[PDB]
Amino acid sequence: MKQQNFCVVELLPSDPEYNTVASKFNQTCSHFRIEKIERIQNPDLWNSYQAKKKTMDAKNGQTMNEKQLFHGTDAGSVPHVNRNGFNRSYAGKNAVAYGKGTYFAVNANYSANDTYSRPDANGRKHVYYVRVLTGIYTHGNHSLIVPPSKNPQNPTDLYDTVTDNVHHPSLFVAFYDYQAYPEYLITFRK
């Protein structure tokens, strides 16, 4: 075992990288004021995420395996996520609706809810802009611990994630370590 070593680089508003994260965010969260957008540089978590991506790309054909989603969390889970990512222990902070794992919203305004990006003592809310390996997904249920198996004859091979609606997804549930990378942290208020 390694990692637990990361750097946090604050993006300057003059920087286009900032305006791109802010634009995807403002599509649903234009009513909030961004205090800072930081980039989370965890090399060991990133290398493990890329190696999972190389595998998914080599098995899911034409599928765009990676999506950039949102994850709202409390002020105190920021150290944890920045070190471990969204590991199996962090599952116990999320819901169970579509299975035991980590939930990611498509629209930042779902993740902006006070139940998820709980405002701290200063009133700051934390929403991550995560790189998620969504791959091939099915419909989820509360009883899941691992994604359902694709084929009944071949049940060793399973779905990569689960969603609320397969034709019009709004949220995804990831179940394995290294499936999600907390690339950006968006800190904001009301």
Ligand SMILES: CC#Cc1ccc2c(=O)[nH]c(CSc3ccc(C(=O)O)cc3)nc2c1C
């Ligand atoms: C059904 C549904 C949902 C959904 C949609 C978006 C998010 C999200 O952006 N982050 C998280 C993890 S933070 C969290 C905090 C408290 C609770 C709770 O009290 O149930 C759930 C999740 N969970 C999310 C969840 C659970």
